[PDB]
Amino acid sequence: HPGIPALFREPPLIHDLLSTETTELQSETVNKCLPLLKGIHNSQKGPFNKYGIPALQRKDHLEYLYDSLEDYPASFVALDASRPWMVYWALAGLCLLGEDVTRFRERVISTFTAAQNSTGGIGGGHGQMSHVASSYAAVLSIAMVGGEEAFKLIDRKAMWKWLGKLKQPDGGFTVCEGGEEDVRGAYCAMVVHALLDLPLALPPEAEARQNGLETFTDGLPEYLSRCQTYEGGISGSPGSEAHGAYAFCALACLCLLGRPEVVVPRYMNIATLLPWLSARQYAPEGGFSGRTNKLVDGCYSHWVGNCWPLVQAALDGTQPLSSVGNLYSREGLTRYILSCCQCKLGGLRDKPGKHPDSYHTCYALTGLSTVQYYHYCTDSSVSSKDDFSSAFSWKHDPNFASDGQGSDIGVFTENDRLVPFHPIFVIPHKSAEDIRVWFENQSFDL
Amino acid sequence: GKYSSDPEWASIKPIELNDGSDFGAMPLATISYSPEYLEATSYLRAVMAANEMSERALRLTGDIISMNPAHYTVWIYRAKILFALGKDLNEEIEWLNKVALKHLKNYQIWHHRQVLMSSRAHFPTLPPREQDFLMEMFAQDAKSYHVWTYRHWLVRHFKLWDHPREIQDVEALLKADVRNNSAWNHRYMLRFGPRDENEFDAGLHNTTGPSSEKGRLPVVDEDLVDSELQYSQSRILEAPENRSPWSYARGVLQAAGRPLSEWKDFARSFVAVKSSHAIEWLADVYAEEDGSEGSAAEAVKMLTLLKEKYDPIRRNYWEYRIRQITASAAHATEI
Numbered sequence: 099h100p101g102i103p104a105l106f107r108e109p110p111l112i113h114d115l116l117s118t119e120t121t122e123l124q125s126e127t128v129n130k131c132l133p134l135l136k137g138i139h140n141s142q143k144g145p146f147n148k149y150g151i152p153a154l155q156r157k158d159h160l161e162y163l164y165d166s167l168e169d170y171p172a173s174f175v176a177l178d179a180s181r182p183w184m185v186y187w188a189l190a191g192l193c194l195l196g197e198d199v200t201r202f203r204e205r206v207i208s209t210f211t212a213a214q215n216s217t218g219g220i221g222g223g224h225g226q227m228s229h230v231a232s233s234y235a236a237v238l239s240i241a242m243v244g245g246e247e248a249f250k251l252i253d254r255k256a257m258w259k260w261l262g263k264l265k266q267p268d269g270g271f272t273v274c275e276g277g278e279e280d281v282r283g284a285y286c287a288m289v290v291h292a293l294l295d296l297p298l299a300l301p302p303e304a305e306a307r308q309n310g311l312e313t314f315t316d317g318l319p320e321y322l323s324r325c326q327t328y329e330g331g332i333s334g335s336p337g338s339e340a341h342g343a344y345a346f347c348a349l350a351c352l353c354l355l356g357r358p359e360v361v362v363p364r365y366m367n368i369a370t371l372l373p374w375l376s377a378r379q380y381a382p383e384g385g386f387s388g389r390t391n392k393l394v395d396g397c398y399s400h401w402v403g404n405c406w407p408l409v410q411a412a413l414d415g416t417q418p419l420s421s422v423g424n425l426y427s428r429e430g431l432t433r434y435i436l437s438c439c440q441c442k443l444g445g446l447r448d449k450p451g452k453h454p455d456s457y458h459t460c461y462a463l464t465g466l467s468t469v470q471y472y473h474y475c476t477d478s479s480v481s482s483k484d485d486f487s488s489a490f491s492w493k494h495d496p497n498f499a500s501d502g503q504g505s506d507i508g509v510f511t512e513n514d515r516l517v518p519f520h521p522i523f524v525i526p527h528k529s530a531e532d533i534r535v536w537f538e539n540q541s542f543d544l
Numbered sequence: 545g546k547y548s549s550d551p552e553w554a555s556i557k558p559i560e561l562n563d564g565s566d567f568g569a570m571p572l573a574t575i576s577y578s579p580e581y582l583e584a585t586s587y588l589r590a591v592m593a594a595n596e597m598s599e600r601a602l603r604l605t606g607d608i609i610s611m612n613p614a615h616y617t618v619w620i621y622r623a624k625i626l627f628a629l630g631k632d633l634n635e636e637i638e639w640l641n642k643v644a645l646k647h648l649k650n651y652q653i654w655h656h657r658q659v660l661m662s663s664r665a666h667f668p669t670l671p672p673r674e675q676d677f678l679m680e681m682f683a684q685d686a687k688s689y690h691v692w693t694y695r696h697w698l699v700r701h702f703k704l705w706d707h708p709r710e711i712q713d714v715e716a717l718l719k720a721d722v723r724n725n726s727a728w729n730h731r732y733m734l735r736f737g738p739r740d741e742n743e744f745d746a747g748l749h750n751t752t753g754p755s756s757e758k759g760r761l762p763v764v765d766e767d768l769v770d771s772e773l774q775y776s777q778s779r780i781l782e783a784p785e786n787r788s789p790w791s792y793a794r795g796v797l798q799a800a801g802r803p804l805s806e807w808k809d810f811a812r813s814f815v816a817v818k819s820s821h822a823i824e825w826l827a828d829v830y831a832e833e834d835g836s837e838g839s840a841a842e843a844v845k846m847l848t849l850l851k852e853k854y855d856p857i858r859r860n861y862w863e864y865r866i867r868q869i870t871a872s873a874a875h876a877t878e879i
């Protein structure tokens with residue numbers, strides 16, 4: 099197809115003589131991707147657009163996502179502690195593809211009622227201790243289905259008390275009592291905190307108060323700053339290796355603390371963060387890797403991809419009711435997702451040679467959606483308060499499908515257009531707005 | 545059932561699964577558990593509800609772990625029992641090693657290891673074969689994020705920054721694969737990571753200062769800096785397109801408060817281009833550290849080579865840099 103640039107049809111120009119495991123894996127990945135990028139693999143379905151890219155197989159992915167909400171055989175026992183995640187990934191994927199998930203309200207309520215602990219928070223299921231990731235997943239799922247009845251399911255005060263137990267003296271959060279402390283924990287905790295409009299102050303008997311801390315955000319951006327590495331990226335805990343997944347968690351968390359152009363440059367060195375984030379993207383694959391010298395992966399279309407609207411807002415500043423534009427290749431990412439990450443029977447995958455799963459389906463679609471919109475923060479918030487005010491001022495305009503060549507073009511078709519997602523909350527803007535506004539108008543339980 | 549017929553377990557009644565498959569609508573994403581897993585977890589709910597700290601409960605956690613090592617709750621409960629009963633943690637570590645070897649990609653096992661190992665009463669000093677076991681893991685997956693994370697904690701906990709096996713193991717891994725960025729990251733921590741025990745852990749020095757100065761060392765060992773830079777050049781010469789040693793070198797220079805122009809001639813030797821990292825290095829030298837006329841134009845030339853030939857997927861970033869340099873040069877011409 100003449101609409102496919104040489105950049106996506108050939109290996110890189112520079113090649114070292116030395117062969118190691120790293121280059122062996124990288125070479126194999128490029129070789130698997132090439133026939134798909136070229137659109138000549140027999141597993142691919144059309145129609146192919148003027149850029150030589152297959153359509154998003156909406157019907158196939160819809161069927162996959164609906165099936166993923168039903169029953170699994172005993173072999174899936176490894177997912178037992180992650181059942182709330184499975185609900186979220188499917189609902190998110192369905193929302194992205196334009197489905198009304200209102201009809202799942204009752205089933206969502208039934209699922210999470212059993213998983214909520216009386217001492218507060220939500221765990222992986224009945225008898226499992228509360229965990230920030232399962233609470234995050236449950237809250238976002240509840241946000242998507244909406245309704246007063248789903249909102250009322252959560253014990254707000256208990257959630258607040260439990261989350262208070264996770265606050266650590268160094269400013270971060272553990273994922274559960276006795277569990278690991280990483281920036282994933284901080285991000286999940288603060289999203290739950292923001293969407294439910296929990297009190298900013300720590301519970302009066304929180305252990306962290308013995309360490310001089312008074313609020314959930316005390317010491318937090320400092321903790322996140324200590325997770326930046328010499329590479330410019332952000333690691334899971336201080337001293338660990340920079341990784342796209344933790345870069346998203348850290349940046350999203352910072353943007354929950356204030357305006358991106360204030361908080362991000364203050365706590366992160368953007369001069370090192372920017373090139374490291376840029377370096378996540380490979381050619382000819384087009385997709386993002388998670389860390390230096392490892393492989394592209396469709397889920398980083400979200401983790402790395404959604405770092406970009408946050409960083410770009412930090413550079414542009416708040417828009418009142420001039421931009422640096424997109425600093426990555428939207429064409430490349432779109433080619434990787436649509437040409438390489440679609441499974442013929444439905445669902446999306448990490449990379450060619452991998453089976454699809456609902457996690458990779460959710461995040462590849464989330465990344466595809468982000469390239470289709472201009473996401474920016476404004477001076478107009480749907481929040482009636484000032485805490486997380488900037489986080490609820492995010493708005494969106496469509497970035498329409500392009501014609502011809504260019505450095506920043508939309509190579510998806512308009513038939514491929516997905517619903518926009520909030521870059522921090524990873525749900526539709528209206529869903530995040532509705533849940534936050536509802537809780538803001540509820541008095542805190544006694 | 546196993547537990548339901550064991551006299552060891554007669555004294556306690558299991559708590560049956562409540563998934564909401566009786567009340568209201570049908571739950572989502574259900575799993576048809578094996579009868580063995582159903583029974584074990586029903587007894588686990590019972591012992592956890594009673595806060596039971598016993599040998600039988602300990603065995604139970606081991607059984608459930610053998611069926612599902614990604615059960616986060618059971619690991620935490622297991623740790624509680626081990627400390628409450630004053631169990632031999634050396635034996636627990638030997639058991640944990642076997643679980644780790646069976647489940648390479650499981651990270652819960654490694655938080656558990658940290659919890660146990662952090663106990664000074666049981667592990668006052670670095671166990672004599674702990675570093676060897678880490679190398680047994682790295683021999684199977686040299687970039688395992690969770691094992692590297694554990695090793696960082698281990699170094700800080702036992703103060704192993706200058707321990708010869710830490711640097712030796714890093715160099716063994718870099719010999720096997722010079723592109724192992726996890727090994728380079730650990731090397732930075734050993735050589736330039738903050739060590740002050742009265743401070744919170746950080747990946748970089750000077751996080752209390754301006755973010756642009758993040759990484760700056762309070763006191764600089766100049767001979768160590770020279771040695772690390774020389775090491776970086778030697779590895780680069782083995783494979784110039786390898787990003788890791790170039791990034792490490794930028795980190796060392798930032799920490800030492802030295803300019804990128806210290807490597808100007810080294811970078812030029814790869815330019816007929818044998819390394820795009822050498823091109824990006826020169827771009828920064830000409831743009832940020834060279835105040836002479838024509839230097840701005842040369843930086844733009846370098847960035848143009850990158851956007852058109854040597855790293856074109858990052859065109860929008862290169863162009864952003866070009867715009868920054870153009871504006872800066874215009875401001876310079878203005879004044």
Ligand SMILES: Cn1cncc1[C@@](N)(c1ccc(Cl)cc1)c1ccc2c(c1)c(-c1cccc(Cl)c1)cc(=O)n2C
Binds near residue numbers: 180397
């Ligand atoms: C590192 N990674 C990159 N892509 C997918 C993976 C992961 N190794 C992983 C591991 C831990 C975590 Cl917190 C996030 C991702 C992965 C790999 C396959 C996965 C799962 C996760 C998970 C999963 C499980 C629980 C938490 C999360 Cl965020 C993801 C689900 C699933 O069905 N499969 C096939």
Ligand SMILES: CC(C)=CCC/C(C)=C/CC/C(C)=C/COP(=O)(O)OP(=O)(O)O
Binds near residue numbers: 285286347392
């Ligand atoms: C909210 C949410 C839970 C945030 C976290 C999501 C993210 C994917 C977590 C994992 C990051 C890291 C440990 C990956 C390493 O595994 P790997 O070596 O298999 O992958 P890699 O080669 O791409 O680095």
Ligand SMILES: [K+]
Binds near residue numbers: 231
């Ligand atoms: K998780």
Ligand SMILES: [Zn+2]
Binds near residue numbers: 395396397448
């Ligand atoms: Zn992935």
